[PDB]
Design a binder for this molecule. Sequence first.
Ligand SMILES: OC[C@H]1O[C@H](O[C@H]2[C@H](O)[C@@H](O)[C@@H](O[C@H]3[C@H](O)[C@@H](O)[C@@H](O)O[C@@H]3CO)O[C@@H]2CO)[C@H](O)[C@@H](O)[C@@H]1O
Ligand SMILES: OC[C@H]1O[C@H](O[C@H]2[C@H](O)[C@@H](O)[C@@H](O[C@H]3[C@H](O)[C@@H](O)[C@@H](O)O[C@@H]3CO)O[C@@H]2CO)[C@H](O)[C@@H](O)[C@@H]1O
Ligand SMILES: [Ca+2]
Ligand SMILES: [Ca+2]
Lengths: 588, 588
Amino acid sequence: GNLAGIMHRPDSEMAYVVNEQTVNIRLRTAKDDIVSVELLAGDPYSLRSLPTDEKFYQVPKQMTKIMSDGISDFWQVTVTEPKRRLAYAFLVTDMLGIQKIYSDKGFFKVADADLMDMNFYFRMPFFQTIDQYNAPEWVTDTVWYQIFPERFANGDVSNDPVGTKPWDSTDHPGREDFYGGDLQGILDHLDHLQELGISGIYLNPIFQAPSNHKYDTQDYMTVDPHFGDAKLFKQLVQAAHERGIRVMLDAVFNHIGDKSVQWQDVLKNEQASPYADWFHIHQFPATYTPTDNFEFAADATYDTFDYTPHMPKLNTSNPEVVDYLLNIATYWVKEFDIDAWRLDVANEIDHHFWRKFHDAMMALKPDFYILGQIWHTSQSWLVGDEFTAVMNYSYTGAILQYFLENESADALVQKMSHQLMLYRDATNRMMFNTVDSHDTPRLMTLAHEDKQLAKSILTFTFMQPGVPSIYYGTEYGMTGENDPDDRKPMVWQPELQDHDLYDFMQKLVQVRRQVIAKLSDDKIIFDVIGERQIRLTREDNQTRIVGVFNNGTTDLTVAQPTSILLKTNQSETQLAPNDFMIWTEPVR
Amino acid sequence: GNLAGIMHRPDSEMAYVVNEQTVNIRLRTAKDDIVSVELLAGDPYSLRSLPTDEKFYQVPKQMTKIMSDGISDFWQVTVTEPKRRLAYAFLVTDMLGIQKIYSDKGFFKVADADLMDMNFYFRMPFFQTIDQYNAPEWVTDTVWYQIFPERFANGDVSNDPVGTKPWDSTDHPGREDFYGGDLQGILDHLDHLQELGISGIYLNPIFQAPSNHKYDTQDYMTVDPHFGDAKLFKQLVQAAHERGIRVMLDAVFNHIGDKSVQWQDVLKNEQASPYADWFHIHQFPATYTPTDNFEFAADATYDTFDYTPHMPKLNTSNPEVVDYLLNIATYWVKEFDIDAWRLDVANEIDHHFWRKFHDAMMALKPDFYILGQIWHTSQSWLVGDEFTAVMNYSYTGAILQYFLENESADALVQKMSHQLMLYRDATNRMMFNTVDSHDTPRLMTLAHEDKQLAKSILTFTFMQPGVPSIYYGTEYGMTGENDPDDRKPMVWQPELQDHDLYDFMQKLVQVRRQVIAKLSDDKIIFDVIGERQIRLTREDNQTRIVGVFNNGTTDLTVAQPTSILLKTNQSETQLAPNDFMIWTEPVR
Ligand SMILES: OC[C@H]1O[C@H](O[C@H]2[C@H](O)[C@@H](O)[C@@H](O[C@H]3[C@H](O)[C@@H](O)[C@@H](O)O[C@@H]3CO)O[C@@H]2CO)[C@H](O)[C@@H](O)[C@@H]1O
Ligand SMILES: OC[C@H]1O[C@H](O[C@H]2[C@H](O)[C@@H](O)[C@@H](O[C@H]3[C@H](O)[C@@H](O)[C@@H](O)O[C@@H]3CO)O[C@@H]2CO)[C@H](O)[C@@H](O)[C@@H]1O
Ligand SMILES: [Ca+2]
Ligand SMILES: [Ca+2]
C-alpha cells in the first residue's frame, strides 16, 4: 500500500464531537489504493481496568469510503461511546490484500501491535461539547438575497448625495457614482423579496462612510445619513422579520476609513494621538505619496487594506480596539435584533479577536450566524469557536469553471469533494454559496447572456450542501463586468426585466426551501455519467432528489421520472446540451 | 510522483509565525519520492496592485529536506515579508523529473497555474504575533528533578501520618504505605540538588488529600498538613529560588477526591447540592458498588478518572468550576511565586478551559511554563494558546524501546523524526523528557541493573531538543517496578548509593547546561552509521557537539576527537558494545 498517502489528524475535522456521546472519525488514503478500512475503538481505560475478557479491539467497526478528490479517498464512521472517552486505530487493507494497523504510533502488522496499551491508539480523550462545532438550525431553511444598498432602490430623494444620477439600470457606473439607493428603498420592495421566496437579506455596509460602497468606515455607530437613520433601520429589520426574512449586516473590522475621527486624530497629533496604537504605523507622521489611482499608494507609512491609503489597518490586538469593535458588534445585535454578521476580509484579523467576538455574539443570541469573507481554505476559523461558515468562493468558483469552460465532470466532482472533506459535515451545510457578488462579474455576463447556461449554474449551485444566495438583480438577468460594472442600479422597469428568468428563480427557490431543505440528514452523491454529464443525488431515509445535468455537446436520454420538479427541455426523457432535469423519488 | 503523499496544511505546525515579519513553512512528501521543493511566496496583493513587472513567483526560495520518518520526508523554509501578508505555493519535482505546482487549489503544471490570482495560493493572511507560539527562554537552561514528596526526605517526624514505617530504601512499598516525607525534608536537601546541578524541581501533588500520592484532592487551597503549611512552602520556594532552582507544582484539575467538601456535599444533598453540576452525575444518589480493589468500581453513577469511584470527574465547562480552578491556579502563583504548573490528565479537560488558564497565567507571569501530562500526540494543545509543552512520553518511550530491545537504529530515528515534525520548532525545545516517573518502572530496573546501559539511555536523552528531568534517586541507581514499587524511600545511606553513577550524572548535567543549552539556534542531525550505531549531532554557527552510541554487539572505531566531553570506555578511539563518546569541535 501507499502508506505515505494515509493520514489521520486527531482532534480536527477528522475526529470531532457531534453530541455528548457521539463522534465522527475520518481517514485519508491514496485514491483506490486501500480496499477496506475498519476502526478499532473504545474506552482507553477499559483495556486494563475492566475484569472482562472482551476487549474493544476485538469488534471492529466498518468505515465507509464517502468521497474522493482524485488524489485521495476519504473514509468516515460515526462512533458512540457512553464513557465519553475514545481510543482508536485503523485496520487498512490494500489492493494486494496487505493489512496493517495504523495508529498514533505508526504502521504495524496486527501481530506486532500493542493493542492492550491505551497509549498505542489515537485519542479523543473526553467528549467535550463546549469545544464542539454547532450549526444554527435556522440557516438550513434560508435562501439569501444580497443587496448593495446604494443601487437597490431610491426610496427617498431627499437624502441623495450631491451629484446623484438618474436611476438607469442600463448605465455603466463609474467608481465614484451615486444613484441614491437607501434603506427606505429596501423597505419599499420587501414584497418583491417575499414574492421571490427569499428568507434572508445580506446587506453590504450601511454605516456612515464617504463612498458609494462604504467599506471606508467613518462611524460604525451611525447608519449613513444618505441611507437612513436608526429609527428607519429598526423599522426595516422589524418589517423583514414580520415577513420571515432574517437580516445579516457587513462588519468591516479589518480597516477603518481615513475620514474616521480616530484616523484624523492620528493625522493631527501623530504619535501623541490617543489612537496611535489603534493602527499599524511604521513611521510618523503617517503619510503616503498620492498617485493617479485614488485607491493606490506605493509608500504609505502604515499598513492598509491592499495598497489603498484610505483604509488604514486596525490593530485588533490592542485591547482598546477589541473593546471598541465588540461594543459595535453587540450594539447592532442588541438594539436592532440583526441575525448575522458577514465579516469583511475576516482572514486578516487574528483568531484571538474572533474567539472573543464569537463568545460575545453567542452570549447574546445562541443561534447567531457568523460568516467570514475568506477566498482560500478556512479550516482554522471553522473549528466551532470562531465563525459558523465562510463565503464559499472556492466551491462556487469550481462550479463556474466547469459550466463556463470545458473541463471534465470528473475535475469538478474532484474539486467539490476536496472542499467538503476540508470541513466538518455540519460546517459544510452552513457555507454560503453565491455565484456572483459586488466584487465579481455578474452571472449573466459570465454566461455571455446564455440564459439556459445561467439557469444550469444556479440550479446546480442550489442543489449543493451550503446555503444559497442571490445577488440583487440576478432574478431579472442583470449584466455587468467586475466592480464597478457589477453595481448597476437595480432594474425595476418591466420592459427591461427577464420575466422568464424571474419565474424560473421563483420555482428554483421553492425546490430548495420545500424539498432540499426538508430532507433529514441527507447524503449527497456525485456521479459522473458521461462526458460532461453529472447526476447529483441528495437522499435521506424517505426521499431522494436527483438532478441530471447534460453539459456536453450531444443529447442525453434518461428514464422518464414519475415526479419531475424542474426541467428546461419540453421532453420528459431527452436533455439537449445544457439542459437539466430535477426529480424526486421514494427510496427503495 | 506520489501526489497522495504530498500535503501542506495551512495555519498549523506547517505554516506559523516566528516573529512580526517572519514565518516558517513546511511541506510533507512521500519518502525519497521528491528530489526538490521550491517555495513561490510573497505579498498576495502585490501581484495585481504593484505597477512593477516583477512578480513574487518569479524568484523561488529553495526548501530544505530536514527530516524523514521512514514514510514521509519533511521540507522547511523560513520566509520574511515586510508587508506581513503571504501567499505561497510549492514547486515539487519528483525522481523522474516531473515538476508540478502544489497550491490551495491542488496540483498543476506550471503552465496551467493561475499565478497572477492571489486566490490560487495557500495563505498566511496577516502575521499575527498575538496568535503565535512563544517559548519561555529560561526553560532552555533547565534540568529538572522530580520529587514525589512522601518519599524524598522526612524532615519532621511530628507531622508523620499514623502508621508511618521506618525509612528504608530497600522496602517494596505497598499502595497505602506512609514513610513521612515532607516539605522540610526537601528544604533539608536543597544542597544535594544544587550539587547535582539541577535548576528546576517538579513536585507531585502537595495539597491536602488522604492518600500518599495526593491525586485525590481534598482541598486545593491548603498544603497537606503532613507535608507542611503555607509558611513552610513559601520558605521552600524562596530557598529554591535563592539557589537558582525554579519550582513546578502539580495541578490535579481533571477530578477531585471524594473526601472534598464539594463531593461530600453531593453525597449529603444529592441533586439539591450547590455542587451537583460541578460533576458529571448520571443518576442520583451518586453511588457505586465497592470491589476488593479500592481503586475500581464497575458501576459508579458518575464519571471518574479511569474507573476509580474515589476521583469524581470535575465539570470544567461549568463557569463556577472554571472560576474555582482559576482562583486556585492564580493563588499559588501570586502568593508563592511558583514558576510552572504540570497539568495532570490534561487531555481530558476542555480546550476552552485551557485557553482561560493560559490567559490567566500569562497575565500574572509572561514567562510562565505550562506543562501538560499527555501520553499521545498533543498538537491541538501546543498551538500557542494553551500549553507550553507536554510530557514527552512518546519520545522517551521510543528511546527506551531502542536501548532495551533490539530494533534498528533506523526505527528509532524514524520515530524521533516523526515526533519533531508534529510540532513547531520552538515547541520541541520545550518538551519535558523523563525516562521514568512515579507511574512507570525505574530506569535501573528497566535496564536490569546494567549501569552502562542506564548511562547510555540518560546521555542519549540529555542530547535531545527537549528539556531533561531526573526522577528522584536516579542519580544513585534506585530500582523499582511500576507504581507503587517506583516510589521507594529515597536512598540517603552512602553504603547503598551508587557513587559512580552520581559522579556521572553530575558530569552529564554539566554537559547539558554548559554546552548543549548554550548553543545558539542549533540544528540536530540523526545519522545511522551502522547496525545499532547512531551519531547524534547538534550544531550552531560556532560549535558542533557530537555523540556516538554503539549499541550493537561489535566494537566500533572512531577518529580520536581532539576535545572529548564524556565517554565510558578508557579508549579515545574504541567503543565497545553499549559505550558512547561525546565530543565538541569547531564548525568548518
Ligand atoms: O477601496 C478598496 C475597495 O474597497 C471595497 O472593497 C471591499 C470588497 O467589496 C469586500 O468584499 C472585501 O473584498 C476583498 C477581500 O476581502 C480580500 O480578501 C481580497 O479578495 O480582495 C477583495 C476585494 O478588494 O473587502 C474590500 C475592502 O473592504 C470596495 O467595495 C471596492 O470597490 C474598493 O475597490
Ligand atoms: O487512584 C488512581 C491513581 O491516582 C494517581 O495516579 C495519577 C498519576 O500518578 C498521574 O501521573 C496521572 O496518570 C494518568 C495519566 O494522566 C492518564 O492519562 C493515564 O495514562 O493513566 C495515568 C496513570 O493513572 O494521573 C493519575 C490520576 O490523578 C496515583 O498516583 C496512582 O498511584 C493511583 O493508582
Ligand atoms: Ca435616496
Ligand atoms: Ca514527616
